[model samples]
Target chain A: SMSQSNRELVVDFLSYKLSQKGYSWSQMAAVKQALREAGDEFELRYRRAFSDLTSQLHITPGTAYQSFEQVVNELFRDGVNWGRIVAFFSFGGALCVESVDKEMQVLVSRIAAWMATYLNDHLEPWIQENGGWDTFVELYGNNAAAESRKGQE
Target chain B: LEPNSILGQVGRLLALIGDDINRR
Candidate 1:
């Protein structure tokens, strides 16, 4: 389980764009659940490795998508797990931030598109086999109920 | 982009993650 603050970062990172695009809660709640379950200790565990990859790449707008595919392919080459999925999102966010820092904000949308495509193509099937997002929501969503009662005694 | 926009949120979350990682 993710610590509360860590969980908030995951939820905000995944949900911000959806909300800005006017996606309804009913449509995107499952997406949030997927993130919560996957995002456990992602930054703590993988930041150094992820940062090394990002630091090595010289990402310009012209080659941004190529860089994305190359790195993500390597990340998934070992196999995709929930933690790795969160690392994927972290990698994308790092690229976007770096793009902005370098005045290559144009790459952000392309990065977003590439990420969604990879999710649909590679990750969706794995997620489906693992009981899908509904299972995550069922498990983590109600943790609050039990947690709140623990403090009541 | 607006301060509350998605990109803004990404930047914030990235920073938050970094901060948390650094704290540990």
Candidate 2:
């Protein structure tokens, strides 16, 4: 995995994105709204996924940990990005806010950490090789510019 | 509690959201 310095690049990138978006440090309302939307989506999607897991894990009651671990593992197996990381954490928080089981909250926190560190290990290189997260933040930060630039391509 | 308990819901969200993230 990358160092704290490496993680700082991501922080800087997010800072830049916030600045570019005129994101106000104004009120909890805006923040809460985003959090709610994230949690809302998380619930609907999570409910469906777990329902399937319930069906799949019916045969072996003792294998709960293993099955859950496998499911978590598969999430990071392919690749990952910024929003996905945020989504995991946000969803976890959402579960907690809704007074979800304490154990469930802990588990999701670990899953979030796992997903995050996995990216730090695997994706940090590609991000750096592409000139780092700031470069990407700057590039994608300007949506109008990106779309107009894409017009030629 | 197994997969349908409190953590069950959390696991489900964590798993699928993680998948969605990896895809992007």
Candidate 3:
């Protein structure tokens, strides 16, 4: 029910987010593949970061969900925004996937909720400026078609 | 080493990518 406006930026941003998510997923997959054969290398490179992350997720100490929650809390406290959310999601995507722990899975889902809610709020004005639900529909269709075209190119 | 390996390169890639994303 949105009226028309110049929200190309909004569409552009959404597309950017989508591509980043895809890249993050692909990177995680690549890392997982590497894990099968180069696990020692992975451990050598990332053990300290993991340890630091674990310490931050202190309530349960070892449970990734608790640790991830702590991360989100710090983010929101510091100055949560779209890019920061994306970065954290990107980080969490790699972390949860590499671990494939049940707690991390749950933690990722919680993070998903946070991202969705944040976007819902952040995009509200843009959505209204562009064309409300209608703009989203148009962007969804147009963005996919454009993305595929880019892929073909 | 296993991803279970201590200080894995594969794990490091993930960390690096995550850091890269944050940089943007």
Candidate 4:
């Protein structure tokens, strides 16, 4: 069973992940609804996990909510480039894992590591070959991945 | 372009309500 602290860390991780992906609240709501409808079991389990953290850690629903909002708002206000957002989420995930189970932490870190590797190897080269942002954005939408690629080139 | 920003701010406001409840 995931501990309260671990669960809190997971909430943090999810918030960071979704924010970096530029998911709107409506998108998040859709995801939550889908998960609930799917009866995946983990849906309730994870919600309970997060709730327990809010209750036990004195996180207060408001602070928890605000922290998530603040992080996203900060990114938007700063007009942060896509690569930076990816890097932020990647780093945030690692940080959250560090606060949790060691085994889980390693797993999380590996995911970010893989992303970094992909960017460095395939994605970066593709951007350079494409002649940078104007070309890349012309082909792809203004999504996070494309934006990040633009930053790379 | 930054949908998350709007949602986050709203979420924060909701969180503030939660804090108020806790305090009361």
Candidate 5:
């Protein structure tokens, strides 16, 4: 149970630091909504692309995590941005879905663990420098708010 | 993780998948 909560703490501390930096909940929520929407759309649009991408990997139980890290590294080779972060989650979601589809469910946990590590070790510093999720909210979250408003109408 | 935490929510989503995998 600690392992599960500990994994969540990665995110918990991430936000704690953001709030500690003075970003508001609405701001964070908007960014979260953006991420959520982006994640869902990315999967719907790129499911086939994801399949093709994974199929190219010489995936085995042993090589799966390594392969994931390599490809995700390529995803952020240029830099970390909100778009790329969404891609990161979308990629993870895609991998999990495809893994389940193929009866390779073993990879799902590893994928999550790898993502948690990347978010902590790699993304956090960039996020901190960029004003955390607030910057993302300012840049792209308005569309998310508009989309949510539109959905209610 | 609290509901308002963005990364915590992400973790929850990831955990959701992890839990789902474990369930079946």
Candidate 6:
């Protein structure tokens, strides 16, 4: 469901992760093997989450995939968790944007904003617990420290 | 038999043939 750009970003992240783990550029076979293993795990987790949603929603797989992909694209832009964001967006878009009453629309917008804040508060800890940008840099930034050192010298 | 008439018919036929080929 990820966009081509997001997929590329994930692959780029994985490449850096492997490189940091000391895999050489020419050791493409080993790099690819690691990526395959990690990617399979990613796919399994993704499918499980997707299946849980589809089971509750009564939506067709194709429709669910489309919705999931659209949500993922939006979340990639916002750097937020897709499931929570999609729930907020879906409610706001359907109720507020499509509503005929201006008052109700305002109420829906306020509620959506509150929901977004609550979600952020709850999710921020996970981001922190997971080590956040530091973790991301450690996984994805092989040359960053070296470049910084060179700049200092 | 007339030059313009024969040329027009041939051109139309060629166009039709080209269209058929491209469609196929």
| lDDT by candidate, in order shown | 0.59, 0.46, 0.41, 0.38, 0.61, 0.39
Candidate achieving the largest TM-score: 5
lDDT of 6 by residue, A101-148 (tens): 333344444545554665477556755766653443343233332243
Superior by DockQ: candidate 2 or candidate 4: 2
Candidate 6, residue A112: CA error in Å? Answer: 3.5
Q: Once superposed on the true structure, which residue ranges of model 4 sit more than 4 Å away at CA?
A: A1-62, A98-153, B1-24
Error of 1 at A22 (Å): 23
How does candidate 3 fare on TM-score?
0.31
Evaluated at residue A123, the lDDT of candidate 3 is 46
Candidate 4, B1-24: lDDT as tens digits: 355444444333333322221120
Order candidates by lDDT, high to low: 5, 1, 2, 3, 6, 4
Question: What clash pairs does model 6 have?
Answer: none
Model 4 alpha-carbon miss at residue A78, Å: 2.7
Q: Give every collision pair in model 1.
A: none
Alpha-carbon runs more than 4 Å astray in model 2: A1-103, A142-153, B1-24
lDDT per residue (tens digit) for residues A80-147 in model 3: 33233333445455555544453435555665565566557754555466555433333332233234
The digit string of per-residue lDDT tens for model 4 on A1-153 reads 569889878776775576456552344443333322222222222344333232222223234334433543543353323333332333234334443533344444444564466456645655566565444233322232323334656
Point out the higher-scoring one by TM-score: 5 or 6: 5
Model 1 C-alpha lDDT per residue in residues A76-142, reported as the tens digit of each score = 6646555456667877877888888788888889889999999999999998997776654444343
Model 2's alpha-carbon lDDT is 0.46
TM-scores (chain A) of the candidates: 0.64, 0.36, 0.32, 0.24, 0.65, 0.26
- Writing each residue's lDDT as its tens digit, candidate 2 over A35-102 gives 34444544454555555233333323244345544544443444554434444455435433332332
Q: For model 4, name the residue pairs that clash.
A: A62-B15
Of the pair 3 and 4, which is ahead by DockQ? 3
Instruction: Report the C-alpha lDDT of model 3 over B1-24, residue by residue, as the tens digit.
Output: 354422233333444533332331
Ranking by DockQ: 2, 3, 1, 4, 5, 6
Task: Flag regions of model 5 displaced more than 4 Å.
Answer: A1-29, A44-52, A142-153, B1-24
